[PDB]
Amino acid sequence: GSMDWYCFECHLPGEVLICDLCFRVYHSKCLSDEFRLRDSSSPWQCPVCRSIKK
Ligand SMILES: [Zn+2]
Ligand SMILES: [Zn+2]
């Protein structure tokens, strides 16, 4: 998941990424491009959900 807005003070967009399995909210700018990439087919897994055992 995600939410995006446009800040009228700096005239740049902002985004948070929301894990589809644990619902944690990441600054999109805190994540590398590999861990931001989403496909229109499967849920976005955050760094913890991607990395944790079973
Ligand atoms: Zn701003
Ligand atoms: Zn997660």
Side-chain angles (χ1 to χ4, degrees), residues 1-23 25-36 38 42-52:
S2 59
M3 291 191 34
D4 321 336
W5 62 92
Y6 184 88
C7 177
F8 282 92
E9 200 79 3
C10 62
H11 303 283
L12 300 181
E15 169 178 73
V16 291
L17 294 181
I18 305 159
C19 187
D20 294 319
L21 303 188
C22 78
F23 292 94
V25 189
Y26 291 85
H27 297 117
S28 74
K29 280 193 171 196
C30 283
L31 298 172
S32 73
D33 262 333
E34 181 199 317
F35 284 67
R36 291 167 81 178
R38 267 156 310 151
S42 100
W44 187 67
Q45 296 184 240
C46 77
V48 171
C49 294
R50 268 195 68 178
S51 64
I52 200 159

Short mmCIF file of all heavy atoms in Angstrom, two decimals, unseen atoms left out:
data_model
loop_
_atom_site.label_atom_id
_atom_site.label_comp_id
_atom_site.label_asym_id
_atom_site.label_seq_id
_atom_site.Cartn_x
_atom_site.Cartn_y
_atom_site.Cartn_z
N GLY A 1 0.82 -1.23 0.00
CA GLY A 1 0.00 0.00 0.00
C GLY A 1 0.85 1.27 0.00
O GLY A 1 2.06 1.21 0.17
N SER A 2 0.21 2.43 -0.19
CA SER A 2 0.94 3.67 -0.18
C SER A 2 -0.06 4.80 -0.07
O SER A 2 -1.25 4.62 -0.27
CB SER A 2 1.84 3.88 -1.39
OG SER A 2 1.12 3.86 -2.61
N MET A 3 0.49 5.94 0.32
CA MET A 3 -0.23 7.20 0.24
C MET A 3 0.73 8.25 -0.26
O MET A 3 1.84 8.30 0.24
CB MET A 3 -0.71 7.60 1.62
CG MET A 3 -1.81 6.74 2.22
SD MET A 3 -2.48 7.59 3.74
CE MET A 3 -2.34 9.32 3.20
N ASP A 4 0.29 9.09 -1.22
CA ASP A 4 1.12 10.10 -1.85
C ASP A 4 0.38 11.44 -1.75
O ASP A 4 -0.84 11.48 -1.79
CB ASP A 4 1.35 9.87 -3.35
CG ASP A 4 1.57 8.45 -3.77
OD1 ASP A 4 1.99 7.65 -2.95
OD2 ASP A 4 1.25 8.16 -4.93
N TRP A 5 1.13 12.52 -1.57
CA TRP A 5 0.58 13.87 -1.54
C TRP A 5 1.55 14.80 -2.27
O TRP A 5 2.59 14.35 -2.74
CB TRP A 5 0.39 14.32 -0.10
CG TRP A 5 1.67 14.39 0.66
CD1 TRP A 5 2.52 15.45 0.82
CD2 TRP A 5 2.28 13.30 1.38
NE1 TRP A 5 3.57 15.13 1.63
CE2 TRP A 5 3.47 13.80 1.95
CE3 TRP A 5 1.92 11.98 1.61
CZ2 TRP A 5 4.32 13.01 2.72
CZ3 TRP A 5 2.76 11.19 2.37
CH2 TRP A 5 3.92 11.71 2.93
N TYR A 6 1.17 16.07 -2.42
CA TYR A 6 2.01 17.08 -3.03
C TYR A 6 2.15 18.22 -2.05
O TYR A 6 1.16 18.76 -1.60
CB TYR A 6 1.40 17.58 -4.34
CG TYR A 6 2.26 18.58 -5.08
CD1 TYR A 6 3.22 18.15 -5.98
CD2 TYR A 6 2.12 19.94 -4.87
CE1 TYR A 6 4.04 19.06 -6.63
CE2 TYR A 6 2.91 20.86 -5.52
CZ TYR A 6 3.87 20.42 -6.41
OH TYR A 6 4.65 21.33 -7.06
N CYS A 7 3.39 18.53 -1.64
CA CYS A 7 3.62 19.58 -0.68
C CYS A 7 3.79 20.91 -1.41
O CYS A 7 4.70 21.06 -2.23
CB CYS A 7 4.85 19.30 0.17
SG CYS A 7 5.23 20.64 1.33
N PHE A 8 2.92 21.89 -1.07
CA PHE A 8 2.92 23.19 -1.73
C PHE A 8 3.99 24.14 -1.18
O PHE A 8 4.18 25.22 -1.73
CB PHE A 8 1.50 23.77 -1.69
CG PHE A 8 0.59 23.16 -2.72
CD1 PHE A 8 -0.19 22.05 -2.43
CD2 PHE A 8 0.53 23.67 -4.01
CE1 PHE A 8 -1.03 21.49 -3.37
CE2 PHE A 8 -0.31 23.11 -4.96
CZ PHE A 8 -1.08 22.01 -4.65
N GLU A 9 4.69 23.75 -0.11
CA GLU A 9 5.78 24.57 0.37
C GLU A 9 7.04 24.31 -0.47
O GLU A 9 7.64 25.29 -0.92
CB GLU A 9 6.01 24.38 1.87
CG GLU A 9 6.78 25.52 2.52
CD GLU A 9 6.04 26.81 2.85
OE1 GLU A 9 4.82 26.90 2.64
OE2 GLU A 9 6.70 27.74 3.37
N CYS A 10 7.38 23.04 -0.74
CA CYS A 10 8.60 22.70 -1.48
C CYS A 10 8.33 22.32 -2.94
O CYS A 10 9.26 22.12 -3.72
CB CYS A 10 9.35 21.54 -0.83
SG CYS A 10 8.46 19.96 -0.74
N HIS A 11 7.05 22.22 -3.30
CA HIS A 11 6.64 21.86 -4.65
C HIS A 11 7.24 20.52 -5.09
O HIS A 11 7.63 20.35 -6.24
CB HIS A 11 6.93 23.05 -5.59
CG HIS A 11 6.26 24.32 -5.15
ND1 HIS A 11 4.89 24.56 -5.34
CD2 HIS A 11 6.74 25.41 -4.51
CE1 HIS A 11 4.57 25.75 -4.84
NE2 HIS A 11 5.69 26.30 -4.33
N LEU A 12 7.26 19.56 -4.15
CA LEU A 12 7.65 18.19 -4.44
C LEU A 12 6.63 17.24 -3.84
O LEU A 12 5.95 17.54 -2.86
CB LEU A 12 9.02 17.89 -3.84
CG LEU A 12 10.17 18.76 -4.32
CD1 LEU A 12 11.45 18.32 -3.66
CD2 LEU A 12 10.29 18.69 -5.83
N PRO A 13 6.48 16.04 -4.44
CA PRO A 13 5.58 15.04 -3.90
C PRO A 13 6.20 14.39 -2.67
O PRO A 13 7.40 14.52 -2.43
CB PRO A 13 5.40 14.08 -5.09
CG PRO A 13 6.70 14.16 -5.85
CD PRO A 13 7.18 15.60 -5.66
N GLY A 14 5.34 13.77 -1.86
CA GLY A 14 5.74 12.91 -0.77
C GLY A 14 4.97 11.60 -0.81
O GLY A 14 3.89 11.53 -1.35
N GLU A 15 5.58 10.55 -0.26
CA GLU A 15 4.96 9.23 -0.27
C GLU A 15 5.39 8.48 0.98
O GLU A 15 6.51 8.58 1.45
CB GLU A 15 5.38 8.47 -1.54
CG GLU A 15 5.01 7.01 -1.54
CD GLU A 15 5.39 6.30 -2.83
OE1 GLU A 15 6.61 6.04 -3.07
OE2 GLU A 15 4.47 6.05 -3.59
N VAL A 16 4.44 7.73 1.51
CA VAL A 16 4.73 6.66 2.44
C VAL A 16 4.37 5.32 1.82
O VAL A 16 3.40 5.22 1.07
CB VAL A 16 4.02 6.87 3.78
CG1 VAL A 16 4.64 8.05 4.50
CG2 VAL A 16 2.52 7.03 3.66
N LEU A 17 5.13 4.29 2.21
CA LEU A 17 4.85 2.95 1.78
C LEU A 17 4.34 2.23 3.03
O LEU A 17 4.86 2.43 4.12
CB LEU A 17 6.11 2.29 1.23
CG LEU A 17 6.70 2.87 -0.06
CD1 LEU A 17 7.92 2.09 -0.49
CD2 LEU A 17 5.67 2.85 -1.15
N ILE A 18 3.30 1.43 2.83
CA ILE A 18 2.58 0.72 3.88
C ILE A 18 2.66 -0.79 3.61
O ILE A 18 2.23 -1.26 2.56
CB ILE A 18 1.12 1.22 3.95
CG1 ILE A 18 1.06 2.75 4.12
CG2 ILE A 18 0.35 0.49 5.05
CD1 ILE A 18 -0.24 3.35 3.70
N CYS A 19 3.25 -1.57 4.54
CA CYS A 19 3.38 -3.00 4.30
C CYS A 19 2.00 -3.67 4.15
O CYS A 19 1.12 -3.49 4.98
CB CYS A 19 4.14 -3.68 5.43
SG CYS A 19 4.47 -5.42 5.04
N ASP A 20 1.80 -4.47 3.10
CA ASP A 20 0.54 -5.17 2.91
C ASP A 20 0.38 -6.37 3.85
O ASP A 20 -0.71 -6.95 3.88
CB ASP A 20 0.35 -5.60 1.45
CG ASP A 20 0.21 -4.44 0.47
OD1 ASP A 20 -0.49 -3.45 0.82
OD2 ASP A 20 0.77 -4.56 -0.64
N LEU A 21 1.43 -6.75 4.61
CA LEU A 21 1.30 -7.87 5.54
C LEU A 21 1.27 -7.42 7.01
O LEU A 21 0.53 -8.00 7.78
CB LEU A 21 2.43 -8.88 5.31
CG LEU A 21 2.58 -9.47 3.91
CD1 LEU A 21 3.61 -10.60 3.91
CD2 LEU A 21 1.26 -9.94 3.35
N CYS A 22 2.04 -6.40 7.42
CA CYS A 22 2.07 -5.93 8.82
C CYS A 22 1.63 -4.44 9.04
O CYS A 22 1.55 -3.91 10.17
CB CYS A 22 3.48 -6.18 9.35
SG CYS A 22 4.73 -4.98 8.81
N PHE A 23 1.35 -3.74 7.95
CA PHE A 23 0.79 -2.36 7.90
C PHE A 23 1.71 -1.26 8.47
O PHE A 23 1.27 -0.12 8.67
CB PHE A 23 -0.69 -2.36 8.35
CG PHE A 23 -1.51 -3.09 7.31
CD1 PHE A 23 -1.80 -4.45 7.42
CD2 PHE A 23 -1.85 -2.45 6.12
CE1 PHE A 23 -2.51 -5.11 6.42
CE2 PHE A 23 -2.52 -3.11 5.11
CZ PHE A 23 -2.83 -4.44 5.24
N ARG A 24 3.03 -1.54 8.57
CA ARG A 24 4.01 -0.52 8.94
C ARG A 24 4.17 0.52 7.83
O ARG A 24 4.09 0.13 6.67
CB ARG A 24 5.36 -1.18 9.18
CG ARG A 24 5.47 -1.89 10.51
CD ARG A 24 6.82 -2.60 10.66
NE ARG A 24 7.24 -2.73 12.06
N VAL A 25 4.46 1.77 8.22
CA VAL A 25 4.45 2.91 7.33
C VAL A 25 5.89 3.41 7.25
O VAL A 25 6.47 3.83 8.23
CB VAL A 25 3.48 4.00 7.82
CG1 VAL A 25 3.29 5.10 6.78
CG2 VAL A 25 2.12 3.42 8.21
N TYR A 26 6.48 3.30 6.08
CA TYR A 26 7.84 3.70 5.84
C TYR A 26 7.85 5.01 5.07
O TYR A 26 7.07 5.17 4.15
CB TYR A 26 8.55 2.62 5.02
CG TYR A 26 8.76 1.33 5.78
CD1 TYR A 26 7.77 0.37 5.85
CD2 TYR A 26 9.96 1.08 6.40
CE1 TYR A 26 7.96 -0.81 6.56
CE2 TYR A 26 10.17 -0.11 7.09
CZ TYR A 26 9.18 -1.05 7.15
OH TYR A 26 9.42 -2.20 7.85
N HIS A 27 8.77 5.92 5.42
CA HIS A 27 9.11 6.98 4.48
C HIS A 27 9.58 6.33 3.18
O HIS A 27 10.44 5.45 3.20
CB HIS A 27 10.24 7.86 5.00
CG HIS A 27 10.02 8.63 6.26
ND1 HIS A 27 10.77 8.39 7.39
CD2 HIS A 27 9.24 9.70 6.56
CE1 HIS A 27 10.44 9.23 8.35
NE2 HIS A 27 9.50 10.06 7.87
N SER A 28 9.04 6.73 2.03
CA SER A 28 9.45 6.07 0.79
C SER A 28 10.93 6.36 0.54
O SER A 28 11.65 5.51 0.00
CB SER A 28 8.59 6.49 -0.40
OG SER A 28 8.93 7.79 -0.77
N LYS A 29 11.42 7.53 0.98
CA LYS A 29 12.80 7.95 0.77
C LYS A 29 13.80 7.24 1.69
O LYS A 29 15.00 7.39 1.50
CB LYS A 29 12.97 9.46 0.97
CG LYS A 29 12.55 10.33 -0.21
CD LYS A 29 13.04 11.78 -0.06
CE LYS A 29 12.85 12.64 -1.29
NZ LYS A 29 13.67 13.88 -1.22
N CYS A 30 13.33 6.47 2.67
CA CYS A 30 14.23 5.67 3.49
C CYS A 30 14.56 4.30 2.88
O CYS A 30 15.37 3.59 3.46
CB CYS A 30 13.63 5.45 4.87
SG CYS A 30 13.76 6.88 5.98
N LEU A 31 13.94 3.90 1.77
CA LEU A 31 14.11 2.57 1.20
C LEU A 31 14.83 2.65 -0.14
O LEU A 31 14.57 3.56 -0.95
CB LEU A 31 12.74 1.91 1.02
CG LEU A 31 11.99 1.72 2.34
CD1 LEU A 31 10.56 1.25 2.12
CD2 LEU A 31 12.75 0.77 3.21
N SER A 32 15.71 1.68 -0.38
CA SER A 32 16.39 1.51 -1.66
C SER A 32 15.37 1.17 -2.74
O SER A 32 14.27 0.73 -2.43
CB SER A 32 17.40 0.42 -1.56
OG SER A 32 16.72 -0.84 -1.53
N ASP A 33 15.78 1.33 -4.01
CA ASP A 33 14.87 1.12 -5.12
C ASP A 33 14.41 -0.34 -5.17
O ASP A 33 13.25 -0.58 -5.51
CB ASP A 33 15.46 1.63 -6.44
CG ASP A 33 14.96 3.02 -6.83
OD1 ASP A 33 13.83 3.39 -6.42
OD2 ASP A 33 15.69 3.72 -7.55
N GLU A 34 15.28 -1.29 -4.79
CA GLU A 34 14.88 -2.69 -4.81
C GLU A 34 13.72 -2.93 -3.84
O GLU A 34 12.85 -3.75 -4.13
CB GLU A 34 16.04 -3.64 -4.49
CG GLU A 34 15.63 -5.11 -4.55
CD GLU A 34 16.54 -6.09 -3.84
OE1 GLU A 34 17.76 -5.95 -3.99
OE2 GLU A 34 16.03 -7.00 -3.13
N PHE A 35 13.69 -2.23 -2.70
CA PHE A 35 12.66 -2.50 -1.70
C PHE A 35 11.46 -1.54 -1.82
O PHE A 35 10.54 -1.65 -1.02
CB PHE A 35 13.27 -2.53 -0.29
CG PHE A 35 14.04 -3.80 0.01
CD1 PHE A 35 15.22 -4.09 -0.67
CD2 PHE A 35 13.55 -4.73 0.92
CE1 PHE A 35 15.91 -5.27 -0.42
CE2 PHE A 35 14.25 -5.91 1.16
CZ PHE A 35 15.42 -6.18 0.49
N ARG A 36 11.47 -0.61 -2.81
CA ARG A 36 10.30 0.20 -3.18
C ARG A 36 9.49 -0.45 -4.32
O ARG A 36 8.26 -0.35 -4.35
CB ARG A 36 10.73 1.61 -3.61
CG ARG A 36 11.27 2.52 -2.51
CD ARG A 36 11.96 3.80 -2.98
NE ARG A 36 11.06 4.88 -3.34
CZ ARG A 36 11.44 6.10 -3.74
NH1 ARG A 36 12.72 6.41 -3.84
NH2 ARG A 36 10.52 7.01 -4.05
N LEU A 37 10.19 -1.08 -5.29
CA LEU A 37 9.57 -1.65 -6.49
C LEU A 37 8.30 -2.42 -6.13
O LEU A 37 8.31 -3.28 -5.25
CB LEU A 37 10.58 -2.56 -7.20
N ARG A 38 7.19 -2.13 -6.83
CA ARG A 38 5.99 -2.94 -6.71
C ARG A 38 5.53 -3.40 -8.09
O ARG A 38 5.81 -2.76 -9.10
CB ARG A 38 4.87 -2.18 -6.01
CG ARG A 38 4.81 -2.38 -4.51
CD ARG A 38 4.12 -1.20 -3.84
NE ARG A 38 4.70 0.06 -4.29
CZ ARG A 38 4.05 1.23 -4.36
NH1 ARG A 38 2.78 1.35 -3.99
NH2 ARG A 38 4.71 2.30 -4.81
N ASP A 39 4.83 -4.54 -8.10
CA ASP A 39 4.16 -5.03 -9.30
C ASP A 39 2.65 -4.97 -9.05
O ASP A 39 2.19 -5.02 -7.90
N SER A 40 1.89 -4.88 -10.14
CA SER A 40 0.44 -4.77 -10.06
C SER A 40 -0.20 -6.14 -9.81
O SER A 40 -1.42 -6.26 -9.96
N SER A 41 0.60 -7.15 -9.41
CA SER A 41 0.10 -8.50 -9.23
C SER A 41 0.17 -9.00 -7.78
O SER A 41 -0.71 -9.77 -7.36
N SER A 42 1.20 -8.61 -7.02
CA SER A 42 1.47 -9.23 -5.73
C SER A 42 1.66 -8.17 -4.64
O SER A 42 1.96 -7.00 -4.89
CB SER A 42 2.63 -10.22 -5.83
OG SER A 42 3.84 -9.66 -5.34
N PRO A 43 1.43 -8.54 -3.36
CA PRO A 43 1.52 -7.58 -2.26
C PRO A 43 2.96 -7.11 -2.03
O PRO A 43 3.90 -7.83 -2.35
CB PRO A 43 0.98 -8.33 -1.05
CG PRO A 43 1.13 -9.79 -1.40
CD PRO A 43 1.03 -9.88 -2.91
N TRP A 44 3.08 -5.85 -1.59
CA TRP A 44 4.34 -5.28 -1.17
C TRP A 44 4.69 -5.75 0.23
O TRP A 44 3.94 -5.51 1.18
CB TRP A 44 4.33 -3.76 -1.21
CG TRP A 44 5.69 -3.20 -0.96
CD1 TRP A 44 6.78 -3.30 -1.76
CD2 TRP A 44 6.13 -2.51 0.22
NE1 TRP A 44 7.86 -2.68 -1.18
CE2 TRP A 44 7.48 -2.17 0.03
CE3 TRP A 44 5.49 -2.10 1.40
CZ2 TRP A 44 8.23 -1.50 0.99
CZ3 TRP A 44 6.23 -1.42 2.35
CH2 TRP A 44 7.58 -1.11 2.13
N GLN A 45 5.86 -6.38 0.35
CA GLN A 45 6.38 -6.81 1.62
C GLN A 45 7.49 -5.86 2.06
O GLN A 45 8.44 -5.61 1.31
CB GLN A 45 6.91 -8.23 1.49
CG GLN A 45 5.81 -9.21 1.17
CD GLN A 45 6.32 -10.61 1.13
OE1 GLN A 45 6.23 -11.28 0.11
NE2 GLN A 45 6.88 -11.06 2.24
N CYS A 46 7.38 -5.36 3.29
CA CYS A 46 8.35 -4.44 3.83
C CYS A 46 9.66 -5.17 4.15
O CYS A 46 9.75 -6.39 4.06
CB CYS A 46 7.81 -3.77 5.09
SG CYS A 46 7.83 -4.80 6.60
N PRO A 47 10.74 -4.44 4.49
CA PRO A 47 12.02 -5.08 4.81
C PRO A 47 11.99 -6.15 5.90
O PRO A 47 12.68 -7.15 5.80
CB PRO A 47 12.85 -3.87 5.26
CG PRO A 47 12.33 -2.75 4.38
CD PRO A 47 10.84 -2.98 4.34
N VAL A 48 11.18 -5.94 6.94
CA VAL A 48 11.07 -6.93 8.00
C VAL A 48 10.33 -8.16 7.47
O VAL A 48 10.80 -9.28 7.66
CB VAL A 48 10.40 -6.35 9.25
CG1 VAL A 48 10.09 -7.44 10.27
CG2 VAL A 48 11.25 -5.23 9.85
N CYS A 49 9.16 -7.99 6.85
CA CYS A 49 8.42 -9.12 6.31
C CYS A 49 9.24 -9.86 5.26
O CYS A 49 9.21 -11.10 5.22
CB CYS A 49 7.04 -8.69 5.82
SG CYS A 49 6.01 -8.15 7.21
N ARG A 50 10.04 -9.15 4.47
CA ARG A 50 10.86 -9.83 3.48
C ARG A 50 11.95 -10.69 4.13
O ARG A 50 12.30 -11.73 3.57
CB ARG A 50 11.48 -8.85 2.47
CG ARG A 50 10.62 -8.65 1.24
CD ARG A 50 11.29 -8.00 0.05
NE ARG A 50 12.30 -8.85 -0.56
CZ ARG A 50 13.01 -8.53 -1.64
NH1 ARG A 50 12.78 -7.39 -2.27
NH2 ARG A 50 13.93 -9.37 -2.10
N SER A 51 12.47 -10.27 5.29
CA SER A 51 13.72 -10.80 5.83
C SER A 51 13.50 -11.83 6.94
O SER A 51 14.36 -12.68 7.16
CB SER A 51 14.64 -9.66 6.31
OG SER A 51 14.07 -8.92 7.39
N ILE A 52 12.36 -11.77 7.65
CA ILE A 52 12.14 -12.56 8.84
C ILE A 52 11.83 -14.02 8.48
O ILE A 52 11.29 -14.33 7.41
CB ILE A 52 11.05 -11.90 9.71
CG1 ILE A 52 11.12 -12.37 11.15
CG2 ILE A 52 9.65 -12.06 9.11
CD1 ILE A 52 10.45 -11.45 12.13
N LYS A 53 12.23 -14.92 9.39
CA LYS A 53 11.98 -16.35 9.26
C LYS A 53 10.49 -16.65 9.39
O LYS A 53 9.85 -16.16 10.32
CB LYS A 53 12.75 -17.08 10.38
N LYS A 54 9.99 -17.47 8.45
CA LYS A 54 8.70 -18.16 8.54
C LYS A 54 7.69 -17.29 9.29
O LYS A 54 7.04 -16.49 8.59
CB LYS A 54 8.85 -19.55 9.19
ZN ZN B 1 7.54 19.99 1.41
ZN ZN B 2 5.80 -5.90 6.89
#
